């Protein structure tokens, strides 16, 4: 069908713009500390974004489909064209911002696109205001939770690793611990929410994976910590390797939360085209997640990695231990949001995480100018994309 | 729950012995080409063995639970003591062989253990001969299939890489193709058999993972192929790095097929303690698979770091393209066997794959006294473990009563 080809193209363009605008949220810690080149960061992210999208991305895709527009108050064909309009408008504005090196929330963009459609097609009652209010609350709370976690974690690492009688030995315990906790979070959430297994099985699998991870990472760190004789340099060299893993953690969580910004709308179009109805129980077709994940990966490789040769527009000049802490806090916050089905901004979460570290260490950094740009974009994106989606939808109803 | 504790200890020891004896089967190619150190090989295998055990290990575990002993002819309590007897006996012989550095089949060992228990408890009727027959058939067919796949694949490599106008450019396409095929196989089987999703969805996910894998590996190879000027040196350098991936593939498939050799007996004990009669359809308790996976990983790390760098010395003349091919063919054979629920020997499959790509092999060297020892141990392991398991079971039955 022409509608399915158009929806495939527009969903691919949305996903590509997500990958382009958001790679920095994952890879700027590792690239800024020169733990990896821009090209290695792009290849790794290509894999980890796709993996997060597949293992965990349907939960938020449900919310995007049903949690913004009151879909029952809309005709199926209307929902189809509203999804496409939202994709058109979000994609346009994201690609514009990426052109100018500007960071935007692709989540805020697609949600404003959906809101624009719903307001034009039905009016004020075309919007699911209760769910939308919870989403806006999460938009404000998640950056603060990220800052809070990064604050507490930076302090804990300073106390238990650096300002300690034997930093090397301490680091061989602390860095495995955080890698294992990341693995436990991913595995237990995947087994409970995606595989539908009971809570006890999910926990047991998470513990088992975290035990294997701790063992292996401990012995690798033990090898690495004796490559340098200077203590601080040895610790930082180990954090340098480990913050690649924690970048992968962020890129996974990003795919998990954000594939919805392309797959939710695409899934809405696919379901309406295939059935002619809007079913009460939304199931996200796997083609939608795969299209979105591959699109994000390709955007990472072909337009991202140039965004990042300019500079990591969202986290750069910290030590390896600080990048490690920023990544961990960001990924944990985003994965927990995804487990609740909340579409949040990974951009604003990483900004919150680095602000938290700055409050912990010394307020020089954060760069207040980019912080101001983030706040301006934050305030403008939802109204702008909403108005654009409303106009695109309006025009589109020139259909006989 | 004393019986549960004893089962945990014995299953752990068996799993440890598997990891110790078999890490060579996946990592000796990579270690012998010096693509990685023994220590690195051990850490990688630790993660990949556990991952295969957890993602794909339940299917062969079901066959170990009811494909050797005729479960409906043994009282459940006796099945529980027989499972323990088999674990004790197999572990003992695996550890003896490992201590001398000899690669043996832990699958042949545990099946012999179970057969021995079944024969002493019930006689000729205590053995599930219909299924045991297909298992022995697979023990004969699997190494041959590994050799054949090996041979055909090395021919494919020659045709598509070496016998071409621009072998660097060709390797840039052929190595990503095989890495992608490996990923397609792992994913499609995991989604189909473990997660029990429809065939079309399994294939669709396998293909998407393949596409991403091909893209990423293609650009990594494009980079690597530029490090050496000479065509053949550059291609072998790329195979040298890619055969690390293919060693991971073998490790995963090894965990998938062999966690059963410890998890099947443990599961049988858990099922009897929990419900009594072994039900129509067996569900392997994840605890069994997790214990088996952890024990294999720990055996790889604490003991396998000896027999690995004893198989590896014998194949340091194996080209990187051949080690790549041997691993791919071994892992494919073993994964497909696992998807059929067949408990297979990965040792014999590796040997088959090696003979299929060509053997320098130093042979005569190996020391022919050692080669004779290896052949003897392989022909004798099933009856030796069966007899040891029978003895342990009867001794046990007494000491109890
Ligand atoms: C290293 C590779 C590991 C990642 C493998 C990819 C996992 C793919 C997950 C597919 C989704 C799991 O399958 C899920 O099944 C339950 C059925 O109760 C529900 C949905 O049908 C489906 O989402
Ligand atoms: C880094 C990659 C991580 C891979 C994920 C590792 C966890 C894999 C555990 C798979 C758990 C198997 O869970 C399976 O779910 C199906 C769904 O119908 C049911 C089965 O009883 C169960 O075997
Ligand atoms: Na990082
Ligand atoms: Na962004
Ligand atoms: Na999001
Ligand atoms: Na062996
Ligand atoms: Na190898
Ligand atoms: Na086996």
Short mmCIF file of C-alpha atoms and ligand atoms in Angstrom, two decimals, chain A residues 21-22 25 103-105 314 347, ligand 4:
data_model
loop_
_atom_site.label_atom_id
_atom_site.label_comp_id
_atom_site.label_asym_id
_atom_site.label_seq_id
_atom_site.Cartn_x
_atom_site.Cartn_y
_atom_site.Cartn_z
CA UNK A 21 20.69 14.09 17.15
CA UNK A 22 21.16 11.73 20.10
CA UNK A 25 24.05 11.52 24.75
CA UNK A 103 20.24 19.52 20.87
CA UNK A 104 16.51 18.83 21.01
CA UNK A 105 14.37 16.23 22.72
CA UNK A 314 25.77 17.16 25.33
CA UNK A 347 19.10 14.66 26.29
NA1 LIG C 4 18.82 15.32 21.57
#
